[PDB]
Point group: C6
Chain length 66, copies 6
RNA sequence: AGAGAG
């Protein structure tokens, strides 16, 4: 499982991440949680629960070790 | 399971929530209930059954306790 | 199950619902049936079979009891 | 199962159908086949295999008995 | 199973096929193979692995035998 | 399985692929890993985790053997 | 957030 490798690191190394969404919107934050369906993003003040189905791409601040 | 503590908790506390849809359209209100597939939002007196497949992000009012 | 309650109640009541589609399009009419994948809507004497995957939000005209 | 009722009739009564798609495109034809994933449309000369996932709505030429 | 006789047959006969994507973009070519999730199209010398979730419609050259 | 062959072969060969996204967006880089849900792409020293649900087409630079 | 595909 890359996805889970990727995301748990980005989570415990508190990396800043841009989340690109399906529509083109770009969100920036830190991942504080994830399950099979959803990502929990700390992003500009707020806790936003993102549906994985609406995410296109994670562009990390610093590249992850996998 | 974060999705489900997120949703149940913002439901118990009538947190005011911004739901952003996949299309960009954004909706505002409170979650009356949810199941596997759908989120019942009240939106100023009014009921909207939203499919979660049409939902991108929950941005609640202040931060819940997970 | 909120979806099925919500949806059998609007079918029963013969409620006028706005169905916003994923593209923003809006239909209106009344529900005549559903299954796990589809909603049959009458909208001006015409039956339209809508897939639930293309639906965003059902906004009914009087809130529902569930 | 409405979906299958609907579609098998529209198929054996050779009804003309507009298929509205997720993007708004409108296609017109007769259903010559369907499986769980796909619809076979006779539509302006050609046999087009449509993915159900890309279909929003079937608007039949004459309303179906269900 | 229509999808699968459709695809295998247009693959055996290098039928020229218009694939319309979900976005409207349309692509033209021949199907080299397919699996559960993906259609290998050759498109003038060139290989494109397309996810079927990104595909709306197959419009082949003349009509195949199903 | 064509997808996994296709994709392990471009990962092996270190091929330059264009990945067209569902929105039309184009990325380019090379595949470093995949799982059943995601592709890890390096595109200019940066790792991007793309979901397969957001991918339309992988257009590689030299056709693949499968 | 009222529908004809590069």
């Amino acid at each position: 499982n890359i996805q889970d490798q990727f995301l748990n690191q980005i989570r415990k190394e508190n990396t800043y991440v841009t989340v690109f969404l399906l529509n083109g919107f770009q969100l920036r934050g830190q991942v504080k949680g994830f399950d099979n369906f959803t990502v929990l993003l700390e992003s500009e003040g707020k806790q936003q629960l993102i549906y994985k189905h609406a995410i296109s791409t994670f562009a990390p601040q610093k590249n992850v070790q996998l």
